[PDB]
């Protein structure tokens, strides 16, 4: 009908790179200042993705990615600001989230954490049950919005969530999870990588991905939250993990996980996509649990 969503472009001169945050096979992510981006601040901190190569296949994909990212606006979806196509490399620019991806954040507040969390924003050490439920509730909120628009994520996981000032949790990533978290994907034939531990049996068996596959994945994200970012089926090989999912074996309740939260996970892990709890109902149950956190029983 008509061209479509228009990507805000950014002057290269209004972007000062500071240092890389991350690096991958086909990408680089930088912390940067962005001059005259928003009215209120002359400069402010941003996360800038730099595409490594500028081939016509990357240029097409990039514009499609940017159009898509520009379209999504929500309180629990990472803020996208625009691109810069004026000379190489191609750049995408997002809000900076100081606590990084939710997986890195959870591991830094685990019982097994190597150092203590810097901790001007949040208490170091394990998080409060009420905090865990606040994390889980905000991801569910971002999902409710994605499902609303018939958008299917296909790689939902704490690696692909970001944490900001005040423990704001949003859904987003810079496209580099297949590099930085390569053990989370199964190399299936050639240059297809699947996050099989977060996938339901209909996705593994029938190659089907729906809003209901996202719900299954979210169940595993809940398990990730209540284990402080542990890998699902961490003992198991990729092949072993596929056997479990396909044979109906379920992840065990985490020590930190109240049974009402475990019940939400099990609503997410129904074998039958149509028998799974809606993402709205899952969000509402978690909001309610977050407002009035259960006394998590005994560890005994």
- Asked whether the beta carbons of 282 and 140 are under 8 A apart, the reply is yes
Task: Pull the structure tokens for residue 296.
Answer: 């998590």
Give φ, ψ of 11 to 5 degrees.
-65, 130
Long-range own/partner contacts, residues 9-14 (CB < 8 A, 24 or more apart): 9/82, 9/83, 9/84, 9/85, 9/86, 10/34, 10/37, 10/81, 10/82, 10/83, 10/84, 10/91, 10/93, 11/84, 11/86, 12/84, 12/86, 12/87, 12/91
Residue 226's closest CA among 94, 123, 127, 147?
127
Residue 86 makes CB contacts below 8 A (sequence gap 6+) with: 9, 11, 12
- The reply to whether 27 sits in an annotated binding site is yes
Resolution in angstroms, to 1 decimal, for this deposition? 2.5
Task: State the sign of the Cα–Cα–Cα–Cα dihedral 226, 211, 161, 45.
Answer: negative
- Asked whether the beta carbons of 200 and 274 are under 8 A apart, the reply is no
Task: State the sign of the Cα–Cα–Cα–Cα dihedral 119, 124, 128, 133.
Answer: positive
Residue 288 makes CB contacts below 8 A (sequence gap 6+) with: none
- Asked whether the beta carbons of 257 and 288 are under 8 A apart, the reply is no
Cis before 293? omega within 30? no
Q: Tell me which method was used to determine the 3D structure.
A: X-ray
- Asked whether the beta carbons of 195 and 205 are under 8 A apart, the reply is no
- The reply to whether 224 sits in an annotated binding site is no
User: How far separated are the first and last CA of the chain, in Å rounded?
Assistant: 62
- The reply to whether 26 sits in an annotated binding site is yes
Q: Round to whole Å and give the CA distance between 129 and 139.
A: 16
Residue 32's closest CA among 49, 15, 52?
15
- The reply to whether 24 sits in an annotated binding site is yes
- The reply to whether 21 sits in an annotated binding site is yes
Half-sphere exposure of 107 (CA within 13 A, CB side): 10
- The reply to whether 23 sits in an annotated binding site is yes
Half-sphere exposure of 114 (CA within 13 A, CB side): 3
Q: Round to whole Å and give the CA distance between 292 and 300.
A: 23
Residue 48's closest CA among 7, 89, 87, 77?
89
Q: Round to whole Å and give the CA distance between 285 and 291.
A: 10
- Asked whether the beta carbons of 23 and 30 are under 8 A apart, the reply is no
Question: Among 155, 173, 184, 214, which one carries the catalytic annotation?
Answer: 155
Half-sphere exposure of 183 (CA within 13 A, CB side): 8
Q: Tell me whether residue 281 is one of the annotated catalytic residues.
A: no
Q: Round to whole Å and give the CA distance between 212 and 184.
A: 21
- The reply to whether 52 sits in an annotated binding site is no
Task: Pull the structure tokens for residue 33.
Answer: 């200042």
SS3 per residue for the chain:
CCCCCCCCECCHHHEEEEEEEEECCCEEEEEEEECCCCCCCCCCEEEEEEECCCCHHHHHHHHHHHHHHHHCCCCCECCEEEEECCCCCCEEEEECCCCEEHHHHHHHCCCCCCCCCCCCCCCCCCCCHHHHHHHHHHHHHHHHHHHHCCCCCCCCCHHHEEEECCCEEEECCCCCHHHHCHHHCEECCCCCEECHHHCCHHHHHHCCCCHHHHHHHHHHHHHHHCCCCCCCCCCCCHHHHHHHHHHCCCCCCCCCCCHHHHHHHHHHCCCCHHHCCCHHHHHHHHHHHHHCCCCCCCCC
- Asked whether the beta carbons of 193 and 178 are under 8 A apart, the reply is yes
Half-sphere exposure of 220 (CA within 13 A, CB side): 27
Residue 3 makes CB contacts below 8 A (sequence gap 6+) with: none
Task: Pull the structure tokens for residue 105.
Answer: 């954040």
Task: Pull the structure tokens for residue 70.
Answer: 């520009």
**What is the CATH T-level fold of the domain 100-291, as seen in this structure?**
Transferase(Phosphotransferase); domain 1 (1.10.510)
- Asked whether the beta carbons of 36 and 14 are under 8 A apart, the reply is yes
35, 56, 61, 113, 192 from 14: Cα distances, Å = 5, 25, 24, 38, 37
């Amino acid at each position: 009908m008509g061209s479509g969503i228009r990507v805000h472009h950014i002057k290269r001169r209004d972007i000062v790179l500071k240092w890389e945050l991350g690096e991958g096979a086909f990408g680089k992510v930088f912390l940067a200042e962005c001059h005259n981006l928003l009215p209120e601040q002359d400069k402010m901190l941003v996360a800038v993705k730099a595409l490594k190569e500028a081939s016509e296949s990357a240029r097409q994909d990039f514009q499609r990615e940017a159009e898509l990212l520009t379209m999504l606006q929500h309180q629990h979806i990472v803020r996208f600001f625009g691109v810069c196509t004026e000379g190489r490399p191609l750049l995408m620019v997002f809000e900076y989230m100081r606590h990084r991806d939710l997986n890195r954040f959870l591991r830094s507040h685990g019982p097994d954490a190597k150092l203590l969390a810097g901790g001007e924003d949040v208490a170091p050490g394990p998080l409060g049950l009420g905090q865990l439920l606040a994390v889980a509730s905000q991801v569910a909120a971002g999902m409710v919005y994605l499902a609303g628009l018939h958008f299917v994520h296909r790689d939902l996981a704490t690696r692909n969530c970001l944490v900001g000032q005040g423990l704001v949790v949003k859904i987003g990533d810079f496209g580099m999870s297949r590099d930085i978290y390569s053990t989370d994907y199964y190399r299936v034939g050639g240059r297809t990588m699947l996050p099989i531990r977060w996938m339901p049996p209909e996705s593994i068996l029938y190659r089907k991905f729906t809003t209901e596959s996202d719900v299954w994945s979210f169940g595993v994200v809940l398990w990730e939250i209540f284990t402080y970012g542990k890998q699902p089926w961490y003992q198991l090989s990729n092949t072993e993990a596929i056997d479990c999912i396909t044979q109906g074996r379920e992840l065990e309740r985490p020590r930190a996980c109240p049974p009402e939260v475990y019940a939400i996970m099990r609503g997410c892990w129904q074998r039958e996509p149509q028998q799974r709890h809606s993402i709205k109902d899952v969000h509402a149950r978690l909001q309610a649990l977050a407002q009035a956190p259960p006394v998590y029983l005994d560890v005994l």
